[PDB]
Design a protein around this ligand. Structure first.
Ligand SMILES: O=C[C@H](O)[C@@H](O)[C@H](O)[C@H](O)COP(=O)(O)O
Ligand SMILES: O=C[C@H](O)[C@@H](O)[C@H](O)[C@H](O)COP(=O)(O)O
Lengths: 608, 608
């Protein structure tokens, strides 16, 4: 989730609370900072709620100090939320981490043994009493820590502090990212370089394992053993616009509408000469890519749907057997490795628990090699992969992925043409794919200029609480997607069915008041589809159908047609996605929902 | 669908209306018979509705004749239901078919040319004016037909009659089954030997293509060309109990509760000596089965879910790469054939459009060979296959498959152990599978004796209209299944999610009033699951959890636990299915629904 850390000479709270705000997406149930003033007065503070719930519990009780550590959260397993909220104050040790401490039991028991007393349920409060115990046994903090770290198992990103000596903050990185922001006289710790974006812009990105010792006037980093290290330090880029929603009322909407430029980024330096280019893999790709006979794809939620759309392409175009499983199942299941199998995770975060263990698994199951289509660079998926292709999406703040989706398509789509050519197939296959790609941007541009109309439809969903999404083909999953959206950002019970599955059961749901969103280009499967539309139609189902301008569909009280600008077909599933995104967003407004942090959720799921 | 045909000396209506009643499952939108009395008075009759809607429109206007043909239907594409209802009276030619006439256009136009006039939209009414035109050009009916048949494309099962000469009925078979029931002085035609079950029990099962000429006192069958044929004639068996619901209020319920004996049938003559036996394939199976490296599985609705459960087994036990696609998508999609791929349809009917073309496709795509796990013998899937294994389910009348499911599992499960052994694997794998199999019956027995309790739960769903089904593992799809049920037989919007997918989106749906059915044995994935239960739990979601007696779960207003009799684990997905079946049925009663013919549906989808 979100974890921030100041240690300057000014007051560090209204920054700590900022860092949080700019990590509210990674987590939005509980929050709270801990600062201390000169003298030593600790001042822990927690609130259930948005970060603002804290903010306000700060104005009421301003916190002075130049040593604090904040923290937002995803309260998942539930639990007394304000009791189990960070930070936790082990007498004088305050901690806040990001992650999961595996051995959080073999410890909690062992300590406890030694008269310890965990007043709260939680793994953070274990870091504390652990580090603390280590003070007692000699050394300095930057020593008590360098000893306790290696006795923890998991992936975490804690930032330990001694209320008796706010002179130093400790920061370890074992999994969850922790970047350090460099200030003047001051420093800052963060889980992401986006918290600190306001104050510094100069970051030393902790490598994996580091236990950096930080003060106002120094930042000493040590490797895992305890050696000293000289981590470089770079200036940020991830600031294009930072987390400024701009003209846009919500992040999704801006993120939705960035798709057209967002793809351009992706198709940039890759569409070199009528034919997709991906040298970026370094001439050693055509030696593993080429032995490829099958493709396994790990993913979750939207990152999976994409995996789907692709399977259609990898086969009907690359001619390559391909599976596209949900990471959650894969990882725990004994399985049968195809011969010559390129594993291919499709995270946007790069840091998702499941798609990542998956990957990890893959390694042992003798796959041919990994490939990684992340959004975020140097991400756990990207560095443990073997090959990787980056979406160039830009940072996506929306809890509900959108441009990360469209980008993914574009990439995969590109990989297809590479693989296509790589396989002496028809040089025309690449050509065709490219033309789409190399014209997707302009086209989504086209599509968005329909905002108004879709915004109009959404009115019809005020009163509904169910919705059916139908598609067939390499649009089965596009219809999967637009459900997942609407479903998530408006709470409507939307469900997606592969069109030709209705009559085998689900078709019982239809009725007078059941809207049915359907996507329908000038596909070959057009008529097949045109049918199951008529099948639902003939049973009540109110029908919103996003159909190519030249489909043939005809308007009607029961059957609402939303003309679609003729698209290509290689990029058809991307295109037809967009309108479905608008609709989910707009219905969400009509619904009056947290368009940007839907309940029980929180962008990127990196827990486990 | 359902098509019946009398031609006796008594009055044939109260039989025709019976035949229909006993094919109401195959179709239940529109109906209607046509008889004629001695003199020649035709008497066509149609009604929207159950067959009974006709029945009653018969009592009001008794139909005398000893030559009639009836017919129930699935009105799918909708259309003026009483206008487009069979039979259709082309002046003197009355027809009724079962199936789809492809060229139903290149004809409708051509004829029409010749001053013809189709007062109704429909493909039946095309058979008529077609056969008719053929009278005019010479010959006798049994000649005008034998000429018109070969000018039709599709799969059909029409039974043509001449109102000017009820002396003869014609019957052709091009796809849809047509069996002939033999009486004394009288005959009968049928789409299934179950219509006629009351009158005769002696059937000559038309081969594929036959154009049988039938009168009271003869039944001449001719092959496709026009030759004479001597089709054998067998006595029925499919009459165990016929379509007599017995003690049981609905077919599902009886069919649900037949599972325990229904499996026994399946495990009969196959569990020969501590180890599954399937010689029934004839010593030429271990020569294709053995070269098998991958398994593709086609299916729809419940017949697919089974395909799922299996994939888990074929891999984690047989060690064999396996895909399990929805037939509807497969069939229309260019794809990549694994090397050495055993295709394997999983119909119960054997006659499903999609799973069958699928199969058909398979043939061209160089698979290694077909295998067929049908319920019904000599079924289109079973005869075009290459290998086949029959469920021994018994005829299932329920529109909502149940025992066909459990049987399928059992079979596949058996195939796994065959393949397992066939692959020098651990002799212990077979052993273990068998023990389950060879103890599934007794165990489901166990499970049903919980009826009451589940019947109790269902009370809690009166007011609900959504439901979430969660499972993980080789129970992801078992949770898929029990949704499809409830979803179909009660209209509740039930949805199944692989447990570990919640946090990536859908988990937004949960709330105060969202029941969540979850299946949870003493799996290894127990705790994983135990979690997402707690995740939903912690967000409102009312939780009905079907968990092993020794799970650990604890009762609670928000979390309803329904102890499950410890089962094995190889057969665990079958077992945990049953309770989910009860619940759908019981909720359906509380709902007050067509537990046996849910709306917009109709057992086996054989249209296209
Ligand atoms: O609608 C929500 C998004 O679809 C979300 O579900 C996301 O796609 C998954 O949780 C995947 O995580 P990553 O893409 O970042 O790995
Ligand atoms: O709940 C309804 C049944 O699940 C039904 O969906 C059936 O399974 C499919 O239509 C498959 O047809 P076959 O099994 O007979 O081929």
């Amino acid at each position: 989730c979100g974890i921030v850390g100041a240690i300057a000479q000014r007051d560090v709270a209204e920054i700590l609370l900022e860092g949080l705000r700019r990590l509210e997406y990674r987590g939005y149930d509980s929050a709270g900072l801990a600062v201390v003033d000169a003298e030593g007065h600790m001042t822990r503070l927690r609130r259930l709620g948005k970060v603002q719930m804290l903010a306000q519990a700060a104005e009421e009780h301003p916190l002075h100090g130049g040593t604090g550590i904040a923290h937002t959260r995803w309260a998942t397993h539930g639990e007394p939320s304000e009791v189990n909220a960070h930070p936790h104050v082990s007498e004088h040790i305050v901690v806040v981490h990001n992650g999961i401490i595996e051995n959080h039991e073999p410890l909690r028991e062992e300590l406890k043994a030694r008269g310890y007393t965990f007043v709260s349920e939680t793994d953070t409060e274990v870091i504390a009493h652990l580090v603390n115990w280590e003070l007692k046994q000699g050394g300095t903090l930057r020593e008590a820590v360098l000893r306790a770290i290696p006795q923890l198992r998991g992936a975490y990103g804690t930032v330990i502090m001694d209320s008796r000596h706010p002179d130093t903050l400790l920061a370890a990185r074992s999994g969850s990212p922790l970047v350090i922001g460099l200030g003047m006289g001051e420093n800052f710790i963060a889980s992401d370089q986006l918290a600190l974006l306001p104050v510094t812009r100069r970051f030393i990105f902790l490598e994996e394992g580091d236990i950096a010792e930080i003060t106002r006037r120094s930042v000493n980093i040590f490797d895992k053993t305890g050696a000293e290290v000289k981590r470089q330090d770079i200036e940020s880029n991830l600031q294009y616009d930072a987390g400024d929603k701009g003209i846009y009322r919500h992040y999704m909407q801006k993120e939705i509408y960035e798709q057209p430029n967002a793809i351009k980024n992706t198709l940039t330096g890759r569409i070199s000469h009528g034919q997709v280019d991906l040298s970026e893999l370094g001439p050693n790709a055509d030696e593993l890519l080429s032995k490829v006979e099958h493709i396994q794809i790990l993913a979750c939620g939207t990152s999976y749907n994409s995996g789907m759309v692709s399977r259609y392409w990898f086969e009907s175009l690359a001619g390559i057997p391909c599976d596209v499983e949900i990471a959650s199942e894969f990882r725990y299941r004994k399985s049968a490795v195809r011969r010559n199998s390129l594993m291919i995770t499709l995270s946007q975060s790069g840091e998702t628990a499941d798609t990542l263990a998956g990957l990890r698994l893959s390694k042992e199951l003798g796959y041919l090699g990994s490939l990684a289509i992340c959004n975020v660079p140097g991400s756990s998926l990207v560095r443990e992969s073997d090959l990787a292709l980056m979406t160039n999406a830009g940072t996506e703040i929306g809890v509900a992925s959108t441009k990360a989706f469209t980008t993914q398509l574009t990439v995969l789509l590109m990989l297809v043409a590479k693989l296509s050519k790589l396989k002496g197939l028809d040089a025309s296959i690449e050509h065709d794919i490219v033309h789409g790609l190399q014209a997707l941007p302009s086209r989504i541009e086209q599509m968005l200029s329909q905002d108004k109309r879709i915004e109009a439809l959404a009115e019809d969903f005020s009163d509904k609480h169910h919705a059916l999404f139908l598609g067939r083909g390499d649009q089965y999953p596009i219809a999967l997607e637009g459900a997942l959206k609407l479903k998530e950002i408006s709470y409507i019970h939307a469900e997606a069915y592969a069109a030709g599955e209705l009559k085998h059961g689900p078709l019982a749901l239809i009725d007078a008041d059941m809207p049915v969103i359907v996507v329908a280009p000038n596909n070959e499967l057009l008529e097949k589809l045109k049918s199951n539309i008529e099948e639902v139609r003939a049973r009540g189902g109110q029908l919103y159908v996003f159909a190519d301008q030249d489909a043939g569909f005809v308007s009607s009280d029961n059957m609402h047609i939303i003309e679609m600008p003729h698209v290509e077909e290689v990029i058809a599933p991307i295109f037809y996605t967009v309108p479905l995104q608008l609709l989910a967003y707009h219905v969400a407004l009509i619904k009056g929902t947290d368009v940007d942090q839907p309940r029980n959720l929180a962008k990127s799921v990196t827990v486990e």
